[PDB]
Amino acid sequence: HYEEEYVLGFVDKWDELIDWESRAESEGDTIINILKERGVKKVLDVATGTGFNSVRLLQAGFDVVSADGSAEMLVKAFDNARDHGYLMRTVQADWRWMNKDIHDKFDAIVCLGNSFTHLFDEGDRRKALAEFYALLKHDGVLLLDQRNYDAILDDSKHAHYYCGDTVSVYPEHVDEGLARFKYEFSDGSVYNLNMFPLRKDYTRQLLHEVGFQEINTLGDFKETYKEDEPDFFLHVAEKN
Numbered sequence: 598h599y600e601e602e603y604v605l606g607f608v609d610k611w612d613e614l615i616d617w618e619s620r621a622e623s624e625g626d627t628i629i630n631i632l633k634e635r636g637v638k639k640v641l642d643v644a645t646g647t648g649f650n651s652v653r654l655l656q657a658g659f660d661v662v663s664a665d666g667s668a669e670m671l672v673k674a675f676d677n678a679r680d681h682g683y684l685m686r687t688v689q690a691d692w693r694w695m696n697k698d699i700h701d702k703f704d705a706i707v708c709l710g711n712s713f714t715h716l717f718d719e720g721d722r723r724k725a726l727a728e729f730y731a732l733l734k735h736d737g738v739l740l741l742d743q744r745n746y747d748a749i750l751d752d753s754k755h756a757h758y759y760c761g762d763t764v765s766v767y768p769e770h771v772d773e774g775l776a777r778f779k780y781e782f783s784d785g786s787v788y789n790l791n792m793f794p795l796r797k798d799y800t801r802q803l804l805h806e807v808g809f810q811e812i813n814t815l816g817d818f819k820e821t822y823k824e825d826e827p828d829f830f831l832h833v834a835e836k837n
């Protein structure tokens with residue numbers, strides 16, 4: 598109940614203070630170019646959230662199906678797409694049973710916005726990746742991103758900023774099984790969120806173990822004040 602309300606408040610706050618035009622500039626066209634270079638046409642977003650990545654792909658002319666576990670997220674995402682002049686195709690769906698209400702196969706799946714880290718059970722991780730794998734066409738690709746937890750687990754901790762100084766993100770607590778981040782916004786709002794601190798090679802291992810053939814992991818520098826280490830990684834996992 599309340600945990601879901603809390604996260605909905607968090608994404609509302611992020612979107613209230615950080616517009617998508619700005620964000621689409623901070624982030625590059627990395628994702629779009631990867632899909633374009635592969636001749637991708639049909640895309641499934643499995644972590645739609647308030648819709649940023651789905652709308653970016655709709656704008657770029659991809660055929661997109663936008664899934665999420667949360668109906669409240671999908672309402673936000675549909676109306677945001679609407680506001681940008683696009684009709685979103687939303688589907689509420691659980692990562693443990695993705696083909697319950699999705700009956701198509703896709704050229705690409707995107708699982709972006711550091712959403713995979715929210716699973717704390719390994720069985721759930723494998724199950725989700727296996728569900729994604731099954732929804733891809735033979736020559737399909739999975740794009741899945743995450744924060745760089747290796748930097749945090751092996752060190753001397755400090756905040757990362759996004760969209761100028763609009764929000765700071767600070768690892769309040771970190772151990773091998775949990776990272777709690779403090780998100781502090783420019784208007785004074787504070788949110789604290791838990792996630793599982795996936796090591797880069799652990800995610801790659803899981804992808805390989807469920808049947809993905811080749812995985813290339815890219816450093817993704819999203820934060821305002823760049824460091825030698827990227828604050829995000831982007832895994833590009835090819836089904837075959």
